[PDB]
Every structure is written in structure tokens, then in C-alpha cells.
Design an enzyme around this catalytic site. Structure first.
Site, mmCIF file in Angstrom:
data_model
loop_
_atom_site.group_PDB
_atom_site.id
_atom_site.type_symbol
_atom_site.label_atom_id
_atom_site.label_comp_id
_atom_site.label_asym_id
_atom_site.label_seq_id
_atom_site.Cartn_x
_atom_site.Cartn_y
_atom_site.Cartn_z
ATOM 1 N N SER A 38 0.891 -1.221 0.026
ATOM 2 C CA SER A 38 0.147 -0.094 0.093
ATOM 3 C C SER A 38 0.947 1.295 0.068
ATOM 4 O O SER A 38 0.780 2.371 -0.653
ATOM 5 C CB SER A 38 -0.928 0.133 1.309
ATOM 6 O OG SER A 38 0.047 0.197 2.472
ATOM 7 N N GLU A 144 -10.642 -30.308 -1.722
ATOM 8 C CA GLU A 144 -10.198 -30.743 -0.602
ATOM 9 C C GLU A 144 -11.233 -29.960 0.490
ATOM 10 O O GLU A 144 -11.626 -30.475 1.325
ATOM 11 C CB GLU A 144 -8.834 -30.242 -0.041
ATOM 12 C CG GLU A 144 -8.333 -30.971 1.194
ATOM 13 C CD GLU A 144 -6.880 -30.523 1.148
ATOM 14 O OE1 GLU A 144 -6.174 -31.380 1.027
ATOM 15 O OE2 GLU A 144 -6.556 -29.313 1.719
HETATM 16 MG MG LIG Z 1 -4.108 -33.025 1.506
#
Ligand SMILES: [Mg+2]
Ligand SMILES: [Cl-]
Ligand SMILES: [Cl-]
Ligand SMILES: [Cl-]
Ligand SMILES: [Mg+2]
Lengths: 252, 252
Positions: A38, A144
């Protein structure tokens, strides 16, 4: 007492003190020094920390100094040109978060086009790297996460569902940034900037509405939204060709 | 529409097929193969993915195969013994999340007791490494987050506050796990397990209630509770001796 309010002056004064120290200590081994983040974009807020990069000539140099005075915090990364250029051209799943650095460089010392070389390297990454990163993100992150929230639905704990929903929204934002080859400005603007992009997977806007409003207490509505987004991912990846053969049990 | 539900028996069948493939493909270069994570822990849930590690003989080996079959996901990490032992003894800010791998190893092939060496290495890390990791976490993560939410208080966007509060609760949970030298079981159990521990910083439990209940829509309340947690961190570090060095303006 945590970070204090500071002006740009005050930050830039600190920056130049650090620049002078870096040059005093490492001398001719310093090819360039820049500010990023920033402060590098001249969008620093009253409480922003200070991020600096230093390009070294020294072979295999790769270290950092990160410290606080109690009132402000500074991070200075030191890399050899070859290590930094390698890092600038590698596309991981969080590239939209990490590589905004290279599009926000405020050069403060440069002995010969080094910072421009970094920027050119960052902006010239070939399309295949983004395609590969997206496919890997689908497998390593989103698939996942789908298993995690389905586990929550059947065996708990729902006390993790708000945190998981935030993580999924952020991974979706990385997916969108990789697709458009765009780096988010700050971590605080990620979701705001992600939902403004075109061609989002369906269900992503609704998921981000929960996360941005903070209304994450209705677990059945969150699971519905996550499944809807997961379905949208399946349609979106097929539409854009981010598909690998998944028919074999073992693909090596 | 995977991930699908699988039994533990089905997962172990998949695991042993992959073991046979690794031995077939990489032969004498394979020192050991283990399953880790929930499956290694025999606490895998209906939708859990499969995580495997492989110790290789070639000294610079470092690669992985990560894929899905559309119905389940597998990750196999291949590392030389030297790379794995070094990684097992490094304590980063997310050690409580990442290094549960090494306390959940189910050996399925081992030509030299290699996986026990890995476990012993992970278990024998000296207390100073956790002390250093705690101080670094406070400077590198929590101090940064404090700046981010203080910026939010004065200039927005409040739409990032639910996500930021989740990140802060997770960083607090890493702090607690580092203090107790304990790895969290699953990522879904982190907050539940962190808040049962002793020696919590004041304000951490109250903050985690927002994150675990998903009641993250009241911005003033989140800002007050973050500030209270930040104060509790200061008292907690003094009590436990995690003194961050604030004496130098420039520490190099
Ligand atoms: Mg994994
Ligand atoms: Cl897939
Ligand atoms: Cl799976
Ligand atoms: Cl040690
Ligand atoms: Mg920063």
C-alpha cells in the site's frame, strides 16, 4: 500498544533511514531497493505496515528482516536477482495475493534497471502457468474443501463452518484472479475486487454475500451455498477447459 | 459430484495400491512410504482425502503427485530423507497445523526405520524453537492484523472484517498450539481444541465465540473484541515470557 497512526512522510522518513542503513551495511552488493504494498501504491492507510524489497548481487542470497518498534512494523526481504526473478515468474495458488508486490514497486534505489526487470518478469508470465495453477487449485484447495464441509454436514463440527466458508471464498477469489491474471491490491480488498470481475463461477456471488455480510450463523444455508458454488465450479472449469483426465485411480 | 463417501477399508485399499505403484515406478530409490493425517490417525471421516508421504534416496528429491479420481483425492509428497528431516524440525507460525503430519504416520513400507527417525526428529524439537516462533507470529501476523482492523475502523471496508476476524482467531490458535507444543488433530478441530486449552490470552475465547457461532455481522462488536484480544496478547506474552524485542529502530 499496537500500530499507531502515521502519515506518509513519517513512513517515507522511516523508509529512507532503512535505505541508508541497507546501503551502509551491504554496499555494492545492493542492486536495488524498493517499497511495495500500500505504501508503494501511495494508498497506505493510517495504520499500514512498511514493506521493502532489496535486490542483491550476492549469489544465492535469500534472507529477511522483519521487526517492530511497538509503534510500527517493517519487513525487508533480500534476494539475489536470480532468486527474485524466479519467484516473480512462479504461479502458485495464492499468486493473486502475493504477486501484487511486483505491480506496486516504488523504487528508491536502483543501480541499473533492476526493479524494471522484476516488473517485466512478473508481467510477462506465460499463459500455461496460469492454466496449470488453476487446475492445481481446483484439486489441492477446492476439492479438499468440499470434502471438509461434507464431513462437517455428516459428523461436525459446525463450529468450523464459518471459518471454512471464509477459506472457500478466498480460494474462489484466487481462482478468479488467476483466470483474469490480476493481482488484488490489498488483502482487505480481495473479496470486493473478486466479485466485480466478469465470468465468475455461479454461486460465488451468493457465497461472498454471506462472508462479506458476516451472516455465517445459519449452517444449512452455508452448506447449501457451498454446494451451489461447487456445482458452479464444475460448470465453469468445463466451460473454460480447466479439466484434466480423472478416470484413472493412479495417474502416474 | 465427488468427493464421495468411502469407508476406512476402502481408503486403505487405495493406499496399498498406491504403495505398490510407487515401488513399481521408483524402485530402490524409495526408502519408506507412510500414510498420515486422519487416515494415519484412523479417525478419517466419510469424505476425507488421502495423504501419503514418501522418503526417497536421491538427496535433492522434492516433488509430489496430487490428483482426484473425480470421487476421491490423493496427495503423495516425495522428499529425500535430508529434506524431510530438516522440514520436520522447523517450527513456523503454522507448525500446529502442518506438523501433525509427523505425529500421525502409519508406515506401510519402510526399508530402514526411516519413518521412525522422522517422528523422533519432529518430537525432539527444542523449546527455544517454539519461543522464537511465538515471537515471530506476534510480529509478523498479529501486529499486521491489528493494523488491518484499525484501518478498517477508520476507513473501511467492514466487508473484510468477518474474514479478518476468522484469520485472527486462527492465528491465536497457532499461538496457543505453539505455547503447548501440540499439533491440532484436524483443521476443523483447531478452534474447538485451541479454546479448551489452558493459558488462553484474555479476550481470545470471547473472540472465538463470534467465529465459531458465525455471528460476524456486528462490526463494532468485532472491533471491540479484536482490540480486547490484542490487549490480552500483550498481558499473555509478559506472563509467559514471550518478549518481543522493540528496542531497535533498525535491527541490522
Ligand atoms: Mg491434502
Ligand atoms: Cl476433479
Ligand atoms: Cl477424497
Ligand atoms: Cl531442536
Ligand atoms: Mg504487509
Amino acid at each position: 500498544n499496537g500500530p499507531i497512526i502515521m502519515t506518509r512522510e513519517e513512513r517515507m522518513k522511516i523508509v529512507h533511514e532503512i535505505k541508508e542503513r541497507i546501503l551502509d551495511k551491504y554496499g555494492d552488493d545492493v542492486k536495488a531497493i524498493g517499497v511495495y504494498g500500500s505504501l508503494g501504491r501511495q494508498t497506505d492507510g493510517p495504520y499500514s505496515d512498511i514493506d521493502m524489497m532489496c535486490v542483491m548481487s550476492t549469489e544465492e542470497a535469500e534472507f529477511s528482516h522483519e521487526w517492530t518498534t511497538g509503534e510500527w512494523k517493517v519487513e525487508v526481504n533480500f534476494d539475489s536477482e536470480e532468486i527474485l526473478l524466479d519467484y516473480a515468474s512462479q504461479v502458485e495458488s495464492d499468486w493473486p495475493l502475493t504477486h501484487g508486490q511486483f505491480f506496486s514497486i516504488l523504487p528508491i534505489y536502483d543501480s541499473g534497471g533492476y526493479l524494471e526487470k522484476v516488473y517485466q518478469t512478473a508481467k510477462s508470465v506465460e499463459a500455461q502457468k496460469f492454466h496449470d495453477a488453476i487446475c492445481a487449485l481446483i484439486v489441492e484447495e477446492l476439492f479438499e474443501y468440499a470434502g471438509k464441509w461434507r464431513n462437517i454436514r455428516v459428523q461436525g463440527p459446525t463450529t468450523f463452518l464459518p471459518s471454512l466458508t471464509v477459506q472457500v471464498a478466498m480460494a474462489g477469489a484466487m481462482l478468479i484472479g488467476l483466470h483474469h491474471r490480476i493481482c488484488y491490491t490489498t488483502s482487505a480488498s480481495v473479496l470486493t475486487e473478486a466479485v466485480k470481475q466478469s465470468d465468475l463461477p455461479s454461486g460465488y456471488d451468493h457465497l461472498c454475500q454471506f462472508v462479506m455480510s458476516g451472516q455465517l450463523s445459519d449452517s444449512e444455508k452455508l452448506l447449501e451455498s457451498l454446494e451451489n458454488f461447487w456445482n458452479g465450479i464444475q460448470e465453469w472449469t468445463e466451460r473454460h477447459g480447466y479439466i484434466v483426465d480423472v478416470s484413472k485411480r493412479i495417474p502416474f
